[PDB]
Amino acid sequence: DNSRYTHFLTQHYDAKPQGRDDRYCESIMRRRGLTSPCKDINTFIHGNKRSIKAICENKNGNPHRENLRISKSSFQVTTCKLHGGSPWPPCQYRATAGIRNVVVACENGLPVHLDQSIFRRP
């Protein structure tokens, strides 16, 4: 079904953010249900949803590493990194904005998984 794709959009897609700063992270992580308890790191992709889906096809993607796909285009992204040493709220975040290639895993031609590890640096 469409459920794993919808999960991916919920955790990793925000088309038109205002801010892209710490307060943006603190709010969107809460809106998307990632603060009970606090997720340690999470990246949102901005812009055109259909360009993200195209990573699963030759239009905007290539094979990457072990059965993943990397985008041909680059995307505006915001990575939210949890501050401090507790998994429990309050969930305070620091934002890192970037323009990056995105790595996904696809199922049935839809992105379902972000390779979140690549956004740990910088």
Residue numbers in the entry: 2 to 123
Please give sentences taken from the publication describing this entry.
Angiogenin (ANG), a 14-kDa basic protein is an angiogenic ribonuclease and member of the bovine pancreatic ribonuclease (RNase A) family (also known as RNase 5). In addition, the crystal structure of human ANG has revealed that it has an RNase A fold and the catalytic triad (residues H13, K40 and H114) is conserved.
In the native ANG structure F100 and V103 residues (located on β5 and β6 strands respectively) are in close proximity to the substrate binding site involving residue E108. The results from two variant structures F100I and V103I are analyzed here and both the variant residues are well defined in their respective electron density maps. The introduction of an Ile residue seems to have slightly increased flexibility in the vicinity of the mutated residue.
